[PDB]
Design a protein around this ligand. Structure first.
Ligand SMILES: [Mn+2]
Ligand SMILES: [Mn+2]
Ligand SMILES: [Mn+2]
Ligand SMILES: [Mn+2]
Ligand SMILES: [Mn+2]
Ligand SMILES: [Mn+2]
Lengths: 241, 235
DNA sequence: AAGATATCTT
DNA sequence: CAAGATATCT
């Protein structure tokens, strides 16, 4: 499938290459900084041609948002089925020590999830799948000078334990918010193999959704409705009260 | 000065070089995506070597934060007087007049040590390196094809200016409460034709700006109403 | 104006 | 954790 091949290929590409800098037309290279955003940006640019290569080997077109603040990074679809779109987002986190537990921010829970068309490239109901390509690395100077193409193997790299997975968003979604004032779904908090294997907390994609479409924006209010999965099934069990 | 040399070095670098992709140690290059999370990341790293070089030429230690949501990008300071620190932040925006976002108005400026590398009272200057550009491929390239790689921008312009001089009176962001710069012409930022009469005024004004339009309306919404408020005894 | 896009600190 | 920081756009 498109899926087994995308992960095999991102997987393979990660094993074979190491981004070490950004380069200019003239050939001068500038090392990578350490802070998180440099790396999310980079893993994302890293994924892009791979995603496109596999997509067209299977015949799907790939459309990135033509506008900012719009989900998802990549919209895949066969013209044959415009209502079977596939959303692919990139999510990244770090580790201070290899193989420790991790969590990601999975996107807003108050735009397209509640409003079919807010901040999303196509209406929400035209997608049948929402995948997350997740990157995990261990955060790790000669990083402040520039280099030339002949010194590529000695440029210091801001990280080292890079791992990559591809999994359905509802599947690794957790029950606590991933951020506050920017209202993001939080993923589970767990080791890398738990993301690869699907050991999430929802029973289904409808439960993930119903949960996030009714979770209050603050602890205040979550006091009265529900604040985690157990309470939320108690509230459902009672009649949504 | 440290200032005029950094300014001249950044103009020069900007002029001579065009960032066009990220490169791997095996020699494979990935082109640049379009959204902004990308350009700000790239200009910031593009700025790194120049800042550490001009700083060293002047006797300053350069320092970045460990914790990632901590201002400023660069803290410059001579070892001998750790108490006169210089803050350098990078801010970017696109052109099709421009406005930038300039950082929070509720963290360190109101409470001396929040989200900041060194207590706010230890910095005696806050500079903004501003990058503006005009907003214009899914395969990979090799070192020989550098000039074939599409660039998501055209015509970058860089300026260096004190954060207070270019600060405006309208929030530059809502839920992330950012100070907004003036909304003007690039020349204006270079020439420093701001609206505050002093940095004392810019800081008192953002230290006391309210979060929502509602509350702001009972206090002030712009520099005019703020100068009225001062006249009423801050009430 | 307010709240989206990503993820980290406290 | 929950809340609010990092940048900057609609
Ligand atoms: Mn994207
Ligand atoms: Mn994304
Ligand atoms: Mn829209
Ligand atoms: Mn930085
Ligand atoms: Mn900054
Ligand atoms: Mn701190």
């Amino acid at each position: 499938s498109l899926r087994s091949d995308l992960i095999n290929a991102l997987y393979d590409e990660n094993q074979k290459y190491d981004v070490c800098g950004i380069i200019s037309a003239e050939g001068k290279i500038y090392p990578l900084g350490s802070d998180t955003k440099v790396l999310s940006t980079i893993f994302e640019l890293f994924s892009r041609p791979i995603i496109n290569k596999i997509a067209e080997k299977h015949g799907y077109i790939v459309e990135e948002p033509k506008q900012q603040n719009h989900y998802p990074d990549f919209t895949l679809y066969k013209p044959s089925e415009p209502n079977k779109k596939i959303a692919i987002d990139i999510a990244t986190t770090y580790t201070n020590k290899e193989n420790e537990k991790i969590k990601f921010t999975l996107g807003g829970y108050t735009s397209f999830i509640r409003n079919n068309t807010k901040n999303i490239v196509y209406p929400f109901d035209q997608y049948i799948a929402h995948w997350i390509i997740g990157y995990v690395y261990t955060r790790v100077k000669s990083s402040l000078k520039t280099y030339n193409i002949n010194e590529l193997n000695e440029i210091p790299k801001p990280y080292k334990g890079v791992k990559v997975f591809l999994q359905d968003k509802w599947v690794i979604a957790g029950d606590l918010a991933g951020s506050g004032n920017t209202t993001n779904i939080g993923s589970i908090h767990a080791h890398y193999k738990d993301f690869v294997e699907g050991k999430g907390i929802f029973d289904s994609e409808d439960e993930f959704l119903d949960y996030w479409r009714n979770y209050e924006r603050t602890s205040q209010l979550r006091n009265d409705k529900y604040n985690n999965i157990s309470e939320y099934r108690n509230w459902i069990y009672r009649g949504r009260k």
